[PDB]
Amino acid sequence: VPHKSSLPEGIRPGTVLRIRGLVPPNASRFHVNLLCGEEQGSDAALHFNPRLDTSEVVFNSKEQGSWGREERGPGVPFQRGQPFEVLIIASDDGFKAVVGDAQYHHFRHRLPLARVRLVEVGGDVQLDSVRIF
């Protein structure tokens, strides 16, 4: 079951999402979605998708059900069995992903930031906390 964090007032530049958890020892993939609503099929402003099986971290958007052009971070700074800390930071020009102690990727806004209303974490992941600062 996905972890669904409603944010009815939305997010703004300076919003920090702090995600702490652990990658299960048998994990293949997990994701963090910033979605525009609570309904099924809602558009995704950001889809942040570590893929342990294919050694990549995919970034994308989704509109009217269709995935956009994939972007990728460098390598895969996640390991089966190991804890992680991810920051997703909103700015006027996009999202910054931070993993561990380092800036990881910058994802330029594709959808208006003001549309985001929900953070969804799904897939093969153990979540300890998802915090909005």
CATH code of the domain in which 31 resides:
2.60.120.200
**Residue 102, C-beta contacts closer than 8 angstroms, at least 6 positions apart:** none
Q: What is the largest CA-CA distance in the chain?
A: 37
Quickly count: other Cβ atoms within 10 Å of residue 76's Cβ. 16
Two structure tokens written together for 130: 């998802």
Q: What is the amino acid identity at position 132?
A: I
- Is 73 one of the annotated binding-site residues? yes
Strand, coil or helix: 115 = helix
Q: How many domains does the chain have?
A: 1
Task: Give the experimental resolution in Å.
Answer: 1.8
- Is 72 one of the annotated binding-site residues? yes
Two structure tokens written together for 30: 């997990």
- Is 71 one of the annotated binding-site residues? yes
Place of tokens 């390991």: 79
Task: Show the domain range for 15.
Answer: 1-133
- What is d(CA 12, CA 58) in angstroms, rounded to the nearest whole number? 23
- Is 68 one of the annotated binding-site residues? yes
- Is 69 one of the annotated binding-site residues? yes
Experimental method: X-ray
